[PDB]
């Protein structure tokens, strides 16, 4: 009986999590312990930090007898995960100090079982401390809205200034073709709460970011119907996709200075 | 100019 | 209060009009007056004339205090209009002798307002007189049918001969692989009148055209469920997308000689 | 009255058959006789044999007064067939010792008739005898499943070993990233018989194949909801798409040795 | 050969 | 190595 054995009722969530990170992270460790499967990695260009946790509770069931780091090239992992259908049952297994990650995908449509032994790699990356931050401003908004805003602005500029104040949260750009801004205001939608805009303002704040990285983060849009963006002077932007239960995918982006 | 991420976090 | 202020209930129509012309026209003036927003421009290669009018009546509301030419690079305009959702409310504003076109897009889904100040350019283009023509033949047909005919023929030939006579309208090509023709005949569809073929024949006519440009015109297919093609010796082909009310998008194509 | 006149109620089937073969075969003869329209051709690289028959019964009606070979470049044929809508009526005509194949497409949506005269070519290819084979193992399975298995495995390896025994049919690969296998087991789905896995095992067998060619064969997936794969030592793999009635599209693939 | 468009219209 | 197809079939 291997040290790690973690079963997902549907492969979809793991496919989507990896899809949301693979354009940013070449290789990383999946840290497996009693609490679940976590990942922390800087992006290739060292402008962002990816922080992920799939809690044990999201599995059915989850067993991890001893702490296991699974060092993985995400392109390699993608070539295996592609074989899993969204509706496949998916099981991860690994021995102590493993050489491979064992992935088994069971079709829910016919009697087909896929089994992969993915070679692991040795990854030396230091764990970074994410401090407790009281943000000057946060905004929760529909995920796809954030995706469109950032993607569309990126067509006219490499940079975006994000300002939060009493009049809302404004994304503004200046480029060759002119100026653009997108303003979101505190808003409640009773029937469709995912369309609400919830702004928590402690203190006005204004910071500038690379749109390329924000757009990359929006590859997580399928994971959550809402996104939370957190701003403070002197700290990275936090773009948070809170998942079911206490699972999360978070991106921290260093500002321009 | 774009800041690097490391300068915002401490090593554990 | 700016000289021009023109509100569309839905951005869709303007998105689609620009999409239908941007592959042909690099830069042009939008001529704004009491009657509406018009555009006339030769295509980049001076083989075709684009003639467009969005009548005041299509707006809700429309105000233009004095005549205004808005000189615009269509690639630049596209980078802004992309930000508008089809279902956004869209307002164009401009001052007298403007430096920018002000575009405001209001989401109908959440409390999001996009605002762009698009830099204008100075465009010296002479206005061409489009004369009154009694065509030898016209055909009204389903838009998408015309799109497929032209696109599919273009796979085997650069040129198409269009002949109108008592036996209908024939598009014919000769190429390396052989010969192709597509014949449309006078036809009434009672339930689905957009599928009708209405041919008005004054006089047999036969002319040859570049398929590349016809295919380009079919980027207007989404604007109207029917297209009208008008042929006469000694005049350009007219490919007409008549819109709601008296608004239109028209393309005139010089023949091969 | 031409020697060949063959009418399809819907162009779809011929479009799909050519689409399933054109990436493998540059040029070939369509052999027309009393029984129907057949094709046999090696693929460009001489690793596979394509064997096709559209029986007379699939047409409405079919007439072939004398045997006719129609030598065709499939890229050229594709440029014509693209013009046919799936729902068009399609008629093939050809004279004795023809110079062209005449194709007529009649729209079922409006009064549009497309007519093409596709230049033929002289093709000298010897007819190969396909012998009677009692396969060591066959498996019938959902077409799209086979498509995904082969396409997904091809991401990690150029080669696949196919083994049939009492424990089912296993596709296995070994590559840079690790090992992969997909196992199918005898399975009945009462409601959805296309999802059944039917394995006929005479004798255990194991052979290795190029995934590239298997993936190419899966361009036939739209023709049939199930595929039959037949394995024997010393013979090519047979991948069979049996169509309505006694029509078929079959691919034979030489093994690696 | 392809004709140019200008020769079909007069300048206003 | 990949075998060619011809060696599996006879010419008619
Ligand atoms: Na996939
Ligand atoms: Na509100
Ligand atoms: Na858009
Ligand atoms: Na009719
Ligand atoms: Na087509
Ligand atoms: Na079963």
Residue numbers in the entry:
A (entry chain A), C (entry chain A), D (entry chain A): -1 to 255
B (entry chain P), E (entry chain P), F (entry chain P): 341 to 352
Question: How is this structure described in the published paper?
Answer:
Fen1 is a 5’ flap-specific nuclease that plays an important in Okazaki fragment maturation. Key catalytic residues in human Fen1 are conserved in the C. thermophilum enzyme, as is the PIP motif located towards the C-terminal end of the protein (sequence: 342 QARIEGFF 349 with conserved PIP motif residues underlined). The Ct Fen1 PIP peptide-Ct PCNA structure was solved to a resolution of 1.95 Å. 14 of 15 residues in the Ct Fen1 PIP peptide were visible in the structure, revealing a 310 helix and the anticipated canonical binding mode, with Ct Fen1 Gln342 inserting into the Q-pocket, and Ile345 and Phe349 forming the two-fork plug that inserts into the hydrophobic surface pocket on Ct PCNA. As with Ct PolD3, the Ct Fen1 Q-pocket glutamine, Gln342, interacts with Ser208 and Ala252 in Ct PCNA, with the interaction with Ser208 involving water-mediated hydrogen bonding between Gln342 (OE1) and Ser208 (N), as is the case for the equivalent Gln441-Ser208 pairing in Ct PolD3, whereas the interaction with Ala252 involves a direct H-bond between Gln342 (NE2) and Ala252 (O), different from the water-mediated Gln441-Ala252 interaction in the Ct PolD3-Ct PCNA structure. Additional direct hydrogen-bonding interactions are seen involving Gln341 (N) and Ile255 (O), Gln341 (O) and Ile255 (N), Ala343 (N) and Pro253 (O), Ile345 (N) and His44 (O), Glu346 (OE2) and His44 (ND1), Lys350 (O) and Gly127 (N), and Ile353 (N) and His125 (O). In addition to this, the higher resolution of the structure allowed identification of multiple water-mediated hydrogen bonds connecting the Ct Fen1 peptide to Ct PCNA. A salt bridge links Glu346 (OE1) and His44 (ND1) also. As with the Ct PolD3-Ct PCNA structure, the 2-fork plus residues Ile345 and Phe349 display hydrophobic interactions with the surface pocket on Ct PCNA although in the case of Phe349 only a single interaction (involving Phe349 (CE1)) is apparent within the 3.9 Å length cut-off applied in the analysis.
The sliding clamp PCNA (proliferating cell nuclear antigen) is a central player in multiple aspects of chromosomal DNA replication, repair and genome stability. This ring-shaped homotrimer encircles double-stranded DNA to act as a processivity factor for DNA polymerases and a landing pad for the assembly of various DNA processing factors such DNA ligase I, the flap endonuclease Fen1, and the clamp loader complex replication factor C (RF-C) which opens and closes the PCNA ring around dsDNA. Many of the proteins that interact with PCNA, including DNA polymerase δ, DNA ligase I, Fen1 and RF-C, do so via a common mechanism that involves a short linear interaction motif on the partner protein called a PCNA-interacting protein (PIP) motif. The best characterised PIP motifs have conserved sequence Qxxψxxθθ, where ψ and θ represent amino acids with hydrophobic and aromatic side chains, respectively, but other variations on this sequence (so-called non-canonical PIP motifs) have been identified such as ψxxxθ and Qxxψxθ.
